[PDB]
Design a protein around this ligand. Sequence first.
Ligand SMILES: [Mg+2]
Length: 95
Amino acid sequence: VIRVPLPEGNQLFGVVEQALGAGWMDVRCEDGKIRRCRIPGKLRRRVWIRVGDLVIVQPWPVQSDKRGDIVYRYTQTQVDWLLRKGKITQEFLTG
RNA sequence: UGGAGGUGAUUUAAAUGCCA
Ligand SMILES: [Mg+2]
């Protein structure tokens, strides 16, 4: 079929509202809480993360409130390709 | 040969740079 990072293991999905900066990414997840993410040492070179962008993140189990870690960003090729299959519906990005 | 002072002048606008 295809190779995409689905929710496999303990991943999350991350769509930020506004970046406070300095690494911390502020995401409006549908988990319920306001979450704040940080970046590992491999992806601060080739890519670009902005508000209006959907990515997959990975949390740590602490406090289930403010978690997340960037492990993969989504391209203009797959962001809306993950729509018809309904793995995410876009009613949680503007309303 | 090579130096130390002084007096004059010197012209539109013209910002910023992943990451091994
Ligand atoms: Mg001038």
